[PDB]
Amino acid sequence: TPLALAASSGKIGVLAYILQREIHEPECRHLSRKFTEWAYGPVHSSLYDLSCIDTCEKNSVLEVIAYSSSETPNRHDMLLVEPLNRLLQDKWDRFVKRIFYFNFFVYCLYMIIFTAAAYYRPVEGLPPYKLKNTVGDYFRVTGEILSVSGGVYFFFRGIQYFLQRRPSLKSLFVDSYSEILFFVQSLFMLVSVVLYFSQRKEYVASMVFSLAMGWTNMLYYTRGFQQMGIYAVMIEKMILRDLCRFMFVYLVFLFGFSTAVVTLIEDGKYNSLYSTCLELFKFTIGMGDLEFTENYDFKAVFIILLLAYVILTYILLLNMLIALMGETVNKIAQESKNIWKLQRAITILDTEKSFLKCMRKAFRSGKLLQVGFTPDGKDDYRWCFRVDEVNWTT
Amino acid sequence: TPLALAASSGKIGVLAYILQREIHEPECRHLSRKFTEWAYGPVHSSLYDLSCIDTCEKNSVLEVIAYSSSETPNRHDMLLVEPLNRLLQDKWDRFVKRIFYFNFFVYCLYMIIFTAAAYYRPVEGLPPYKLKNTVGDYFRVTGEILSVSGGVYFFFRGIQYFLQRRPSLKSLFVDSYSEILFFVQSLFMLVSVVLYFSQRKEYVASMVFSLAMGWTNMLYYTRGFQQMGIYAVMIEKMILRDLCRFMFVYLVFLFGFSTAVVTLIEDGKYNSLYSTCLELFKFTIGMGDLEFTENYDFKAVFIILLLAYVILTYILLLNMLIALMGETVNKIAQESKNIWKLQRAITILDTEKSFLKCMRKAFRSGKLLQVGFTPDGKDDYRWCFRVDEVNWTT
Amino acid sequence: TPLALAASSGKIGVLAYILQREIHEPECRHLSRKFTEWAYGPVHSSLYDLSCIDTCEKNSVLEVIAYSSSETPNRHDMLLVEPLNRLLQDKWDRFVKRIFYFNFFVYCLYMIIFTAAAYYRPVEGLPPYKLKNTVGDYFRVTGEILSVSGGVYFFFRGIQYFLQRRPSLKSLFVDSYSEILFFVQSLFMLVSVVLYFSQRKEYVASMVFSLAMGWTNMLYYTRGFQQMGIYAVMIEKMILRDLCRFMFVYLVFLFGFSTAVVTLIEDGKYNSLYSTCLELFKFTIGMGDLEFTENYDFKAVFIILLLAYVILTYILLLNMLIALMGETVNKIAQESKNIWKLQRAITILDTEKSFLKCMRKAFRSGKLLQVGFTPDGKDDYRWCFRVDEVNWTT
Amino acid sequence: TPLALAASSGKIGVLAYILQREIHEPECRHLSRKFTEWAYGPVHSSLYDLSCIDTCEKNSVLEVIAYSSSETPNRHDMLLVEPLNRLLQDKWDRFVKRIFYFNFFVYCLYMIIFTAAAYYRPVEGLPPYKLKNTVGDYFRVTGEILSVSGGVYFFFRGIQYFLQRRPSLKSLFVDSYSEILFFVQSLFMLVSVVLYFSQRKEYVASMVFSLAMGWTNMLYYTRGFQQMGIYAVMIEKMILRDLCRFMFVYLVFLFGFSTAVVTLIEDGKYNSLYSTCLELFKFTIGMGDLEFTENYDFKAVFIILLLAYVILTYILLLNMLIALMGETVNKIAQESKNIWKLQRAITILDTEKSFLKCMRKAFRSGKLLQVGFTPDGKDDYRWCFRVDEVNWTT
Ligand SMILES: CCCCCCCCCC(=O)O[C@@H](COC(=O)CCCC)COP(=O)(O)O[C@@H]1[C@H](O)[C@@H](O)[C@H](O)[C@H](O)[C@@H]1O
Ligand SMILES: CCCCCCCCCC(=O)O[C@@H](COC(=O)CCCC)COP(=O)(O)O[C@@H]1[C@H](O)[C@@H](O)[C@H](O)[C@H](O)[C@@H]1O
Ligand SMILES: CCCCCCCCCC(=O)O[C@@H](COC(=O)CCCC)COP(=O)(O)O[C@@H]1[C@H](O)[C@@H](O)[C@H](O)[C@H](O)[C@@H]1O
Ligand SMILES: CCCCCCCCCC(=O)O[C@@H](COC(=O)CCCC)COP(=O)(O)O[C@@H]1[C@H](O)[C@@H](O)[C@H](O)[C@H](O)[C@@H]1O
Ligand SMILES: CCCCCC(=O)OC[C@@H](COP(=O)(O)OCCN)OC(=O)CCCCC
Ligand SMILES: CCCCCC(=O)OC[C@@H](COP(=O)(O)OCCN)OC(=O)CCCCC
Ligand SMILES: CCCCCC(=O)OC[C@@H](COP(=O)(O)OCCN)OC(=O)CCCCC
Ligand SMILES: CCCCCC(=O)OC[C@@H](COP(=O)(O)OCCN)OC(=O)CCCCC
Ligand SMILES: CCCCCC(=O)OC[C@@H](COP(=O)(O)OCCN)OC(=O)CCCCC
Numbered sequence A, B, C, D: 001t002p003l004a005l006a007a008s009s010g011k012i013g014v015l016a017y018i019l020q021r022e023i024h025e026p027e028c029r030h031l032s033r034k035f036t037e038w039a040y041g042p043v044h045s046s047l048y049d050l051s052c053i054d055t056c057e058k059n060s061v062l063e064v065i066a067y068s069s070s071e072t073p074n075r076h077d078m079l080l081v082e083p084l085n086r087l088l089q090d091k092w093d094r095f096v097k098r099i100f101y102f103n104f105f106v107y108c109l110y111m112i113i114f115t116a117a118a119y120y121r122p123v124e125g126l127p128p129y130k131l132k133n134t135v136g137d138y139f140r141v142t143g144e145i146l147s148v149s150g151g152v153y154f155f156f157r158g159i160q161y162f163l164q165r166r167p168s169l170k171s172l173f174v175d176s177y178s179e180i181l182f183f184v185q186s187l188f189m190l191v192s193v194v195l196y197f198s199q200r201k202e203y204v205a206s207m208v209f210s211l212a213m214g215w216t217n218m219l220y221y222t223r224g225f226q227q228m229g230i231y232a233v234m235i236e237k238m239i240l241r242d243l244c245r246f247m248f249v250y251l252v253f254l255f256g257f258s259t260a261v262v263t264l265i266e267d268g269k270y271n272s273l274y275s276t277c278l279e280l281f282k283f284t285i286g287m288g289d290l291e292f293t294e295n296y297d298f299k300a301v302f303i304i305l306l307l308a309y310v311i312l313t314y315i316l317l318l319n320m321l322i323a324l325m326g327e328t329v330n331k332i333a334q335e336s337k338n339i340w341k342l343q344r345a346i347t348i349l350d351t352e353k354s355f356l357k358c359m360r361k362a363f364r365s366g367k368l369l370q371v372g373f374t375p376d377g378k379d380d381y382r383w384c385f386r387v388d389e390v391n392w393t394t
């Protein structure tokens, strides 16, 4: 359709024009989109025809925008057009706000069960473990089998993401950061089951990375909270635009001077590359030891290197990272809000493919008062609408 | 009254119109508010009729604005209208500035007595304590009974706040942060008396929280000092808008990775959840120890977790908090000043209900030259006024 | 004079008008200030009459501006008027730049002598000390008597500051920070001589404060270096506007919670108020120890207090100070430059009262081509001038 | 030539005029520069005559701009003129992008060889070392002789820089920071060979400074990556504008108070100036020890000095450096991008003097359709061109 072709390429001017057309003419109500029904005292109502916007067949304007390949003109600004913004607010507060908070309540009760099933793991060797008849057993083994089943659930839910949208290796690593992190979490959990029944103690490695990931994935549910959701979008921007640029340059100075400190150190505990790469990393934390070794030669060389480390990477690069984060906050004060609107918009559309059996409640704002004097005949119950309101001063 | 109805809903345009009306017409001085008496060389005087603004009966415009429910249109901007701003400056420098500094001088001499009565507390067991005939006794027991009486005073003064304004469970936790903190301070002090005479050593817990709170409550008196008062408003904004958003996300990463570090640690001192949640909190301070334990397995797993902690929460989240505080300073450079004007305005109105017996000094700028040719008759001593001045250029 | 009355009150509009007047009329060259001599191709010269501006008798416009009481309208902006700004640049690069750098070269060679005379102080008891016949003696005792003489010099130079300008107890602590710090430095040095010959070892206390002050006073000479001088003005603004507002609130939380930690601590090493006020100050540095004591009761109370300290004063107030310094840089990006221009302007005028015996070199830009057809007669060598240049486009 | 005279002095208005002239007149195509060949639907082509811009004889406009003495009007803005900007983009993506990445791939494989040849250096005394017949030998000695040859290569490539451009002692230390750091790296490597065969163990000093420098020189290749290259320009600006101004003032307070701490310390381990200048430097890192010594007198003096250190240089100067970096990011948000465009432009022109034997591929955009009706005759294959494109709306 030519409407969805404007949405797919991101033509924001045309998409504003089609969703907001209105003209006073005979045989124009067959063509017009925005209808103005009630003209009372200066607050005037408005009805948007909403034909293929929300509930179209296999190509809907909400589904075209929210599933974009992130290479469009402006995928984040199209949801600010007057029919689309209030409808997603209407589908939120009426329908999906209750079913989103229940999903966050399940996942918060998922990680409590999975923590307490891992916190009280058995300590003796040779997995697996014959559960005793005690009250502590039959009560965390039920905690384990629920926690494994959650890793199975996010695995099959992670596959059917890829089986539907198919981001195809570029929109994967660019526009779908959230669904990978649910999948990699479930991937460590299933590897930790395979290593558990193969009688190896290294399952607790993959369990921990399945547990460290799982709490950091709880920032996914900060969307649906406006002040928190815009905050978690900014955390995404600091990783992709500052630690992409800091941790390259920092690890050059880190691995650079640590290889310069080893070759000066003659022998001892810190003779390896690993044991002194920590000792130069401790300056970044705030636990840097200047005299961390004595067994070398040329003390004047050894402390010029540390001072050239501390001047270059501690009182410059960490104090420069704070300044560059200070500029990307003022730059992404508006763009990070619009990216939050798109993150809510995906979660709204995801539940309509989930709670699809009761498809009547997904429809918005009634289907009535359609065709006032249609030229093809009397079809005044054809298309839906959505009521808004306006302001004063004529 | 229709004037206070504009103040209660926060109609700033109407409230500017009523307090500043003036027109040259016969039988208009009965209706006009702003009077221009002395028209000398280009500095021209101005008199504001001030009828129900300051000293009305049970609904005054200062009392309506300053006791707002924080849900109005602009409660912080209405005090910038030309009669209201200079009057609160006039009631400050003439009347309430002396009686405010005495209240800060009492409370500063309250916390010195309450500190020194707690610093020299008796150390032996089984409270209470038979005071000896020494000079040190009969000199801190008098220090205690004054300090208990201060907790009684802020308790009854905290009740009669709630018995008058009745914030009703929403304006309580939103618009009245200061009066709760005086009340909770007095609440710990009275619990520390009940535990004292019930022969339990745990009174010193509630005494300390009554003493730690009491010095932090001394930031209440930073209002009445313009450069300090605007500074303490900004401390309120950083708690409610940044540590509301930092300490949620920080404690997710903190409790997330600390539960990931326990389940890797086999046994030892740091096997509990509490003993290692401190050890990951020490990275935020600047005392983080990378090799804080050795009794585990898979050292490569244990230090990926700490590095994934330090990268995520130390060189990102603390360096992001500084950037987000850097944006909310430039955003609240003006709003935090106007909130300080409202905090002074409450303290001005609070003393008129306190020093009410000498109610003549509360009246401002005389009650004279009222009705120049009133149409109802000769009533030229009816209503008050307030003199201002103007500038040059006609 | 009415010219200096505009400079004393800071009327910048009138002062721009008097120093830049020019009109084409007969008998106007007796009244005009700005003369335009050479009108070549579009670069046009300009001559400023400069009568009472620089070299007046007992009231000169440079001396009136630069010796202001800091209560004027704009004392920092009057030096941007076109005759005054290029003249101070002319007196700098031609005359005072060489004699300023020699004063910085003496004072830099003063603190090297005074350091090395204190670094090698004798270590045995009972001052004073009979100097031996060694080569090390008769070589630092000469270093001492030069360093004492420098303290005598800054003492008498500090008195004759006050004997001339007389800031009178308000402009002292507001507009003359630099001359106090040279005086207090010399004051510790002279007290350290009185305690030296009175056979008390406490002279080394006042010597150290005379030595710690003396190197911090070397930031005085950062003026005369434009990028450094504007930087040292900003250090003055961070002390007077941020550490005036931080160190009040910080010491309230510091002394507040430290008195809350003592009264919980039963007995031991940290039972005093002083020994734990350091231990809460170490959290600000980055050396804060959470488990710094064990001899108390109610461990849950003891670590709520430390966490309520660290949350309130470390991850809030130090991270808020960086944000507030980030706003006062953008606010004082222009004002701190103009304050540097006034700090140079005082140092230019101070040497004309110092190198006064050769008063001919202090005069600027010649005294010639004065009165072209003066109406009182032929007086064409009466008043001086100063040549400038202009730009293209007619 | 008068064109290059506009480029050498940096007349950006004239240089925009000459490279973009076009007029419709007979006998104007002999004089015009910008040709508009294809006028289709509203995208219109454009051809730039490009005569002495890129491939002139001994004075080319790209070579004049990119080899400027940094004292011109705007050397960084001239590359934004419409022929020059797209041509350097054309010579990048077509020709030099492949040969730049190979140079970064060689140098990255140079420092890996030079690290691993230094990491496994022999530990016994008396250099040089008779290589054994083992497999580890004949495999790092080949690693050494490649790493020495790289120091020889950057030495002769560093000389022929100076033998061609001749920056002449002012553009050396101002406009050529990169080529010095490649040269000083090679200078330490060759000194480390001379000390190696002169049987002295101090070669490992100069090897380390040749290895610490060499990894920091890998930030040279961040140009050619747009988000990284603009980032490394900003690192240059923080060194030259903030650590030029911080490390002067910081070392005054550091050396100031450390000389004040020595003269108070009577005797012991920290009696020297060096041993306590570290202990005051550790406060900047975050490892400052307040009670780092006890053997002195007047403890009240000793901790006023440390608190006057920590207040002045830790909670002021490091927190002021972050604010001043926060202002020079917003100030150099645009200038640092244009300096990156000039750093790419030098690397493009450097390879045309390197890959000069295949000089045909250096020519851009063909040499055809030159002279449409030249007045001197038929010379329609005289000068080259370069095709661009334009936008809609007539
Ligand atoms: C141990 C590693 C932990 C990493 C911590 C990060 C946790 C945050 C989890 C999270 O919410 O992911 C967020 C981003 O976090 C990251 O991807 C960080 C990358 C770390 C390698 C949200 O990304 P989404 O998957 O929701 O995708 C969004 C987002 O990409 C946005 O930019 C637009 O593209 C679109 O709106 C949409 O694609
Ligand atoms: C141990 C815990 C210590 C907490 C430290 C904070 C001490 C500061 C005390 C203080 O002055 O409280 C200030 C705010 O501090 C806080 O409430 C911090 C909340 C911490 C949970 C002032 O609040 P007020 O009670 O004066 O109310 C004001 C204020 O709310 C303003 O926003 C507007 O609403 C109105 O002007 C008025 O309602
Ligand atoms: C151990 C204590 C060390 C304190 C460190 C600060 C050293 C800096 C020395 C210094 O240069 O003083 C500068 C200011 O430093 C301070 O006063 C800091 C106050 C610390 C209590 C310059 O002040 P001036 O004496 O030159 O006066 C100037 C200045 O006041 C300006 O604001 C205007 O008023 C006028 O131009 C003129 O009056
Ligand atoms: C152990 C010491 C390590 C120092 C670390 C810094 C490494 C960075 C290496 C580097 O890329 O050098 C960059 C600058 O780094 C420094 O010079 C830092 C100075 C440290 C004393 C790039 O400089 P260029 O040589 O490419 O020259 C450029 C640059 O000057 C620019 O400003 C303009 O002048 C011109 O575009 C051109 O001249
Ligand atoms: C969901 C599975 C939980 C099973 C936990 C379990 O078997 O341990 C039994 C007790 C642990 O108490 P103890 O500390 O005395 O046991 C020693 C630890 N292995 O459990 C507890 O006392 C606290 C339980 C907390 C659950 C939220
Ligand atoms: C500039 C030197 C200051 C005096 C210190 C000195 O010369 O000695 C060289 C060494 C060791 O210093 P020490 O005072 O401890 O001397 C003990 C002799 N091994 O210390 C150094 O080498 C310090 C190098 C600092 C470079 C920034
Ligand atoms: C307001 C009640 C104060 C009562 C304090 C008291 O009884 O102690 C008597 C002395 C304490 O001196 P000591 O340190 O020798 O006493 C041992 C401490 N228990 O008191 C002092 O020496 C200092 C008193 C300071 C008051 C501001
Ligand atoms: C989200 C809950 C996850 C389960 C946490 C858990 O098993 O910890 C239980 C106790 C610690 O008890 P112990 O350390 O004495 O048990 C010894 C275990 N080897 O510590 C606690 O109860 C911590 C509760 C803190 C909740 C915020
Ligand atoms: C990338 C490896 C660098 C060389 C170090 C190495 O392989 O050993 C693995 C362990 C221990 O390192 P060590 O050098 O101390 O080896 C001692 C053997 N236990 O150290 C680690 O596991 C480090 C993990 C770092 C991940 C960022």
Ligand SMILES: CCCCCC(=O)OC[C@@H](COP(=O)(O)OCCN)OC(=O)CCCCC
Pocket (backbone or CB within 6 Å): C113, C116, C117, C120, C135, C136, C137, C139, C140, C141, C143
């Ligand atoms: C200006 C007065 C200087 C007098 C210094 C003095 O008497 O000491 C003599 C020697 C000190 O050498 P030593 O370290 O061996 O002396 C032991 C220290 N008391 O001096 C030196 O070796 C270094 C002198 C440095 C001067 C800049």
Ligand SMILES: CCCCCC(=O)OC[C@@H](COP(=O)(O)OCCN)OC(=O)CCCCC
Pocket (backbone or CB within 6 Å): B112, B115, B116, B119, C271, C272, C273, C274
């Ligand atoms: C606001 C004053 C509150 C009372 C403070 C107090 O009792 O401390 C008194 C002394 C400490 O004396 P001691 O530690 O020797 O007394 C031992 C007590 N067990 O230390 C001091 O006097 C500190 C005074 C600092 C004021 C800023």
Ligand SMILES: CCCCCC(=O)OC[C@@H](COP(=O)(O)OCCN)OC(=O)CCCCC
Pocket (backbone or CB within 6 Å): B272, B274, B275, C299, C300, C301, C303, C304, C307
């Ligand atoms: C929330 C409790 C988490 C589990 C820890 C707990 O309950 O014990 C109370 C104490 C001591 O904790 P331990 O695990 O070391 O128990 C040892 C018993 N003394 O630790 C505390 O009191 C911690 C207070 C933290 C408040 C933020």
Ligand SMILES: CCCCCC(=O)OC[C@@H](COP(=O)(O)OCCN)OC(=O)CCCCC
Pocket (backbone or CB within 6 Å): D113, D116, D117, D120, D135, D136, D137, D139, D140, D141, D143
């Ligand atoms: C390019 C020259 C490299 C020569 C290195 C060499 O001679 O050492 C031989 C072995 C070192 O293994 P070891 O740790 O057992 O040798 C003891 C260290 N002197 O080498 C290795 O095992 C690792 C080689 C890594 C090369 C990238």
Ligand SMILES: CCCCCC(=O)OC[C@@H](COP(=O)(O)OCCN)OC(=O)CCCCC
Pocket (backbone or CB within 6 Å): C112, C115, C116, C119, D271, D272, D273, D274
């Ligand atoms: C501005 C110079 C002031 C004089 C400094 C001084 O006497 O220090 C001399 C030496 C230290 O020699 P020592 O520590 O061995 O002398 C022992 C003294 N008890 O250390 C040095 O020489 C430091 C020189 C550093 C200059 C930047």
Ligand SMILES: CCCCCC(=O)OC[C@@H](COP(=O)(O)OCCN)OC(=O)CCCCC
Pocket (backbone or CB within 6 Å): C272, C274, C275, D299, D300, D301, D303, D304, D307
């Ligand atoms: C303001 C004093 C607070 C009470 C502490 C006091 O008076 O003693 C002076 C010394 C030592 O303090 P102590 O409590 O450890 O007393 C032990 C006696 N040597 O400590 C000091 O000198 C502290 C100087 C702090 C200046 C900011």
